[PDB]
Amino acid sequence: MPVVINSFNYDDPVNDNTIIYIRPPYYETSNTYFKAFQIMDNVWIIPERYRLGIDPSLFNPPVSLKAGSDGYFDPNYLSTNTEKNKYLQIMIKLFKRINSKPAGQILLEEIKNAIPYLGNSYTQEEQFTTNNRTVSFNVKLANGNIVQQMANLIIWGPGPDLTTNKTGGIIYSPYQSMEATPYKDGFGSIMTVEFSPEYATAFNDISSPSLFIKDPALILMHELIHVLHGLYGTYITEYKITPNVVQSYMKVTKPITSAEFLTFGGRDRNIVPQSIQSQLYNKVLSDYKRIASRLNKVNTATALINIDEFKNLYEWKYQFAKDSNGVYSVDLNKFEQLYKKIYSFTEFNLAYEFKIKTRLGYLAENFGPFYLPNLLDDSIYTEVDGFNIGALSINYQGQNIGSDINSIKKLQGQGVVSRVVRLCS
Amino acid sequence: MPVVINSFNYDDPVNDNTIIYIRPPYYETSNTYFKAFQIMDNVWIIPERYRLGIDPSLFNPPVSLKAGSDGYFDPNYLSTNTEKNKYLQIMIKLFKRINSKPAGQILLEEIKNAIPYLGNSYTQEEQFTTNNRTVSFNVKLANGNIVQQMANLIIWGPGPDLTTNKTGGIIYSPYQSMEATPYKDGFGSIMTVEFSPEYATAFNDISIASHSPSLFIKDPALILMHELIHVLHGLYGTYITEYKITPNVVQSYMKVTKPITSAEFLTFGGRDRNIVPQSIQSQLYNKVLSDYKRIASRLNKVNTATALINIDEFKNLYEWKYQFAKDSNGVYSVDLNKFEQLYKKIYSFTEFNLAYEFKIKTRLGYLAENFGPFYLPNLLDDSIYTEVDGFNIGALSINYQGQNIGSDINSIKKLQGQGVVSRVVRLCS
């Protein structure tokens, strides 16, 4: 029942199975293929910088330009095969870490099993539609022939800013510039993540005050939570809010989508007003009702697939009732349990389950940033324990990197090296 | 049912559970304590050089003795706390590797559960005897109190030769310089291993396709398992040093110098079993059977203990360990069919079979030539060596390319001379 994490080296030959060249979403017209690695079922990693739709000059901002930024920039990151391989091995280690405890095993099982519905707002209701970029992509086999493949998630390396992680869904555009967003409308879609495990920020908490570096596996799990919402089609960008009561730990800047607070979880859930929590709930319910209605009409497909097997799959995914005549509908109690299951995956709960220390809430201040040079070194960071090996688990000493930023900078200047973090320029 | 592998750093404080000070066997008179780390139930690691009974000049041999030897010497290995901690982390990684597959999980469960019999040839038959160095040792707790503790195995770092791993049992001497070796007589005893995971040798093999020879570095987890098989024999009291033999035909892959105990061939397993003569195989079987019959007889007499232990619980434990029959009157005896299965089980653990189960390449047999030796600088780096796969990560598993380090010593030496660095192995001086 727990998923299998596959291993590979960057230079391993294509094998038409776990290592293939693929045409990722939005590369349809340019027809560009990338070497990709199937880390687990339905999840592909492309260990290169994300560059699509991005002005290339942003990868190497000038010195005057750089200082203002919280972030960090280096155009040469992931420019060599050696480093792409290093990136891959780290990603393998973080997936093994997530898969080392039941709470993370369940999350990966969801990422694998919550496949997008074969259709959206602008496709035929009677048809399981497989042939557009929200549900499948072209792959180039070893013999050079092109075939189509379905998947749930594609992970890239970072864009210009090495400290920025982000998740997004895919748009279907049939003609006349129309745009369907099935990842926001209950159907779900293939999701995209830009992830950068070796560049991290730290947070502050009072025991005494001290800085703690973030565990990359928890950072990854945070992105996988956004992914999960996209796959279940509950993903949002709007519903933006600021807190009613500003606590001292908070750094409030602009209104922020309610999704960030639901994603952090714990006490941040209450920052989202009841009125919005009910809106979101009722929107998802209306969308699942629509999907049930449409599922009753499906009698053909755009591919050679087993229609009845996919119908069983969507019955389980959306927890639909199936009556004595084979008609699907939404059962309100099963829906309530499903909505709860989807929003049970949170940074707060996962940090607790993994015995990882994390920030006080989404609006907590980020410090740094830091480069983490030795995630692959088991004397520093393990699959089973992260940084908190042995007695370093006590008060999360394994994540403790110093009192504050200035104190850290002096030490690095004096030549005191840490093998855990390096403060970035 | 699979065991738990613990983690610790060398500098973690004593905690009366996984980290305590222990007074190891033979250190009783000097009363010397060492910081020790319980990697799994009943197994302690002392990540220091093994020095007991060893002439200190041997740690730093002169150019004359050193040049001839196939080994490698460095008096400074494990002299610092940082390097002791590194040694601990590698050992943690190797135990996690062993515990990653069923065949190795079963081995570690045996190491945990085959506790020594509480008695030996020179202790009273009516008594469970706990108070000597073959079954218990002093440990010093966080508050400084000294108590007695039982365990099965203590692992140290290497002695003088950093490439030599070795296993041994403990001797009891009640009086008059007498010596009991319960680990050879069916009882078992606390076992000792000197283990050095970072220094390794390679072996040769000819590919069936290329018809070309190549050297393969040994996986330290398989090297540790080989020593654990010797421990297992000692815990079951079947350990031998004699019964030494040479092969019938010296095959081209072999390098033979002296007779070798039959136990090395049984430990390797596979075709090496057939090197041990049938008459010796029957002698060993009948010796163990005779020793276990004596233990069944002695267990029927036990009515007291030298410590506050639960007597009936330990009787149940030895009933299971030795697979004794128990009749309706509570009388223990040897059942011949259960004995045959136990003996088979003990000797089921072999380097050959574990290598197959782990998809690790190993040498053609115990007498195979060793090459090198090599330093392995990056066992802790998961891009070089992993718990789940060892060196053979991803497509490196095909033809065990992950262990393939080159054509021969000559080519390797030349490449290293040219400045071509490997992150897998370094040829030693």
Ligand SMILES: [Ca+2]
């Ligand atoms: Ca590891």
Ligand SMILES: [Zn+2]
């Ligand atoms: Zn977020």
Ligand SMILES: [Zn+2]
């Ligand atoms: Zn041996």
